[PDB]
Amino acid sequence: PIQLYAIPPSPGELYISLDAKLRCLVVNLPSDSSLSVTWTREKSGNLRPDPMVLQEHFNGTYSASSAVPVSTQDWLSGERFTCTVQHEELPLPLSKSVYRNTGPTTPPLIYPFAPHPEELSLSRVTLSCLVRGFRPRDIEIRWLRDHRAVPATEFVTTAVLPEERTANDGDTFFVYSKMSVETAKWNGGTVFACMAVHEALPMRFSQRTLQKQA
């Protein structure tokens, strides 16, 4: 029942910090008996994977994870990266590939919402952002407050879903993100921003500002 997954980097690590890693996860290993996880890149050059990590599980199994740095330029070029697992119980090696989307691509539309008027009596108000119409589904949302990054613990973003069949090359997707802010700060004119990070955007990210209107 050995399963192998090749996990793509997050849009944030690819397009904001440019320090992305590919990750390979192997599950349901009966042991590390002749276990090996190896990476291959399609083009000339080398890869330098991090040390592989073995975890024990309560269900009596083992999992192995291996991460490898990938440059954003290499990712964007369309290069394919392949992880392969060998094991005593594996008659044939298992491989999975990961690479930048080659299917249809469509940039996200970003719609910021100010607090509902009925929230303004409360000590905190909700700023939110609908991001929709995009392909592929991989997207990251970040927030800024007075031009500085907001910690992830201070907002929440919904898991990406296909849009309803009426909303519009296949499904498009959407996410919604919201951030509770102090009412005094909102009323004070602080500028906030919701940022989408997505491969189909001109510069790979775009932001829309929110600020109280006079």
Ligand X SMILES: *[C@H]1O[C@H](CO)[C@@H](O[C@@H]2O[C@H](CO)[C@@H](O[C@@H]3O[C@H](CO)[C@@H](O)[C@H](O)[C@@H]3O)[C@H](O)[C@H]2NC(C)=O)[C@H](O)[C@H]1NC(C)=O
Ligand Y SMILES: *[C@@H]1O[C@H](CO)[C@@H](O[C@@H]2O[C@H](CO)[C@@H](O[C@@H]3O[C@H](CO)[C@@H](O)[C@H](O)[C@@H]3O)[C@H](O)[C@H]2NC(C)=O)[C@H](O)[C@H]1NC(C)=O
Among 90, 99, 119, 145, binds a copy of itself (CB under 8 A): 119
Contact (Cβ atoms closer than 8 angstroms) between residue 97 and residue 7: no
Q: Which does 43 bind (CB under 5 to 8 A by kind): ligand Y, a copy of itself, ligand X, none?
A: none
Q: Which does 93 bind (CB under 5 to 8 A by kind): ligand Y, a copy of itself, ligand X, none?
A: none
Least separation in angstroms between residue 122's CB and ligand Y is 34
Residues 6 or more apart whose Cβ sits within 8 Å of residue 184: none
Binding mask 27-46 for ligand Y (x = CB under 6 A): xx------------------
Q: Interaction with ligand X in 50-69: which residues (CB under 6 A)?
A: 57, 59, 61, 63
Grouping H, G, I as helix, E, B as strand and the rest as coil, residue 76 is: helix
- The DSSP code sequence of 135-175 is BSS--EEEEEETTEEPPGGG-EEPPPEEPPTT------EEE
Considering the complex, state which of residue 49 and residue 107 has its C-beta at the smaller distance from ligand X: 49
Nearest partner of 22 among 49, 44, 45, judged by Cα: 49
The verdict on 91 binding ligand Y (CB under 6 A) reads no
Q: Residue 96 corresponds to which tokens in the numbers above?
A: 């999975």
Grouping H, G, I as helix, E, B as strand and the rest as coil, residue 213 is: coil
Q: Which does 103 bind (CB under 5 to 8 A by kind): ligand Y, ligand X, a copy of itself, none?
A: none
The verdict on 57 binding ligand Y (CB under 6 A) reads yes
Among 120, 149, 161, 184, binds a copy of itself (CB under 8 A): 161
Q: Residue 210 corresponds to which tokens in the numbers above?
A: 């929110």
Return d(Cα 193, Cα 40) in angstroms, integer.
39
Return d(Cα 39, Cα 98) in angstroms, integer.
11
Q: What is the CA radius of gyration of the chain?
A: 21
Among 28, 105, 190, 211, binds ligand X (CB under 6 A): 28
Q: Which residues bind a copy of itself (CB under 8 A)?
A: 1, 111-113, 116, 118-119, 124, 126, 128, 130, 132, 153-156, 158-159, 161-168, 174, 176, 178-180
Q: Which residues bind ligand X (CB under 6 A)?
A: 5, 7, 25, 27-28, 57, 59, 61, 63
